């Protein structure tokens, strides 16, 4: 009976957390931000259109310099762009053509990518002799690589469909720390500004706050109705936004340990594919299945603008560190720079 005896104590602790979250819920974010002046009509224009990819684009990642970005497509290529001049710097052929995610190291020395091959391939952008080819393959995941982001030139976090995340020592190839709490496939992760915590969204309709060093799941947030496809931190590091198939975006705060606000429209049914805040965190940009992006007001929960230039599913977007521009990747084999 101990098995069933543990099952109903699990229900009690869930009910205890539910009352503790309602206890500190003395007001809504909408009430506090009901008087703030709106951001007004925000209209961004397509400043650049990058035309190099031969198939659908799944991921991209701005470099630290806010100028170079790497994009991933299923044509077996991994292109690195100069956003200022539209010039291609590298066009890396891949072993497997089923790419899902791609990262760019904060130092700009390496890139990473992965997909259905269950490995995370590192590509030294500073090889001494030949072309840019693979330098390291990180194997060990029993599921498809969905997201990965560098911490150093020797450390990178990954997330995969085996419901687990991992922290890697790139040279030794060992898992410094694992992260094992999810029920569904982990679809996206976001590193905190201080690189001490990180959040991950999965197909169990829940996000988790992980401690990078110990591997603990400090906090878990729910409220979504379908799988979470995207995730991103608030600029100060005390909140994060999520995207999901239920055509909604939520905003959770870590100190309050609950959901603050929901971004949605009755006219929106298609799921979310990517999310990213503006530099000040006032804007929440999200890519959808309906070919367009929505620039949301993070404080008032009302749409401020629409990025409508693509002809297929917008699969990824990101904002530069200087907050100067926004890039969008879509299945129409194009990348468009916006501001």
């Amino acid at each position: 009976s101990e098995l069933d005896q543990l099952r109903q104590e699990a229900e009690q602790l869930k009910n205890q957390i539910r009352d503790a979250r309602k206890a500190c819920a003395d007001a809504t974010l909408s009430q506090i931000t009901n008087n703030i002046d709106p951001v007004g009509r925000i209209q961004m224009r397509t400043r650049r259109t990058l035309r190099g990819h031969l198939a659908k684009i799944y991921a991209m990642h701005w470099g630290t310099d806010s100028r170079l970005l790497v994009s991933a497509s299923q044509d077996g290529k991994l292109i690195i762009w100069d956003s200022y001049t539209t010039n291609k710097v590298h066009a890396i052929p891949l072993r497997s053509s089923w790419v899902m995610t791609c990262a760019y190291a904060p130092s700009g020395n390496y890139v990473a990518c992965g997909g259905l091959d269950n490995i995370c391939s590192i590509y030294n952008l500073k090889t001494r002799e030949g072309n840019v080819r693979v330098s390291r393959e990180l194997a060990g995941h029993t599921g498809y690589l969905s997201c990965c982001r560098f911490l150093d030139d020797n450390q990178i976090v990954t997330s995969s469909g085996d419901t687990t995340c991992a922290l890697w020592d790139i040279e030794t190839g060992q898992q410094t720390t694992t992260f094992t709490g999810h029920t569904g496939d982990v679809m996206s992760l976001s590193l905190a500004p201080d690189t001490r915590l990180f959040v991950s969204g999965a197909c169990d309709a829940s996000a988790k706050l992980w401690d990078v060093r110990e591997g603990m799941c400090r906090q878990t947030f729910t409220g979504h109705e379908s799988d979470i496809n995207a995730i991103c931190f608030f600029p100060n590091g005390n909140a994060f936004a999520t995207g999901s198939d239920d055509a909604t975006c939520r905003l959770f705060d870590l100190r309050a340990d609950q959901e603050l606000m929901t971004y949605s429209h009755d006219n929106i049914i298609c799921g979310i594919t990517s999310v990213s805040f503006s530099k000040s965190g006032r804007l929440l940009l999200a890519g959808y299945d309906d070919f367009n992006c929505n620039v949301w007001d993070a404080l008032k929960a009302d749409r401020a603008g629409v990025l409508a230039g693509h002809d297929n599913r917008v699969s990824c977007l990101g904002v530069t560190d200087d907050g100067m521009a926004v890039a969008t990747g879509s299945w129409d084999s194009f990348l468009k720079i916006w501001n």
Partner: protein
């Protein structure tokens, strides 16, 4: 099976002992952050074309 039910119980215990703050201040700090940094957000406050790298000729 049985070992999975026990790890969840202590995991739920860890997330219950968390000290939480009230949303009224959490929403205030979140709001007070955006206003203090809205002046240096290019997308919110557009900078002149003499500063935008994607507009200069």
């Amino acid at each position: 099976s049985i070992a999975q039910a026990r790890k969840l119980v202590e995991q739920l215990k860890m997330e219950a002992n968390i000290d939480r703050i009230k949303v009224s201040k959490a929403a205030a700090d979140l709001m007070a952050y955006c206003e203090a940094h809205a002046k240096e957000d290019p997308l919110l406050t557009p900078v002149p074309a003499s500063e935008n790298p994607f507009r200069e000729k």
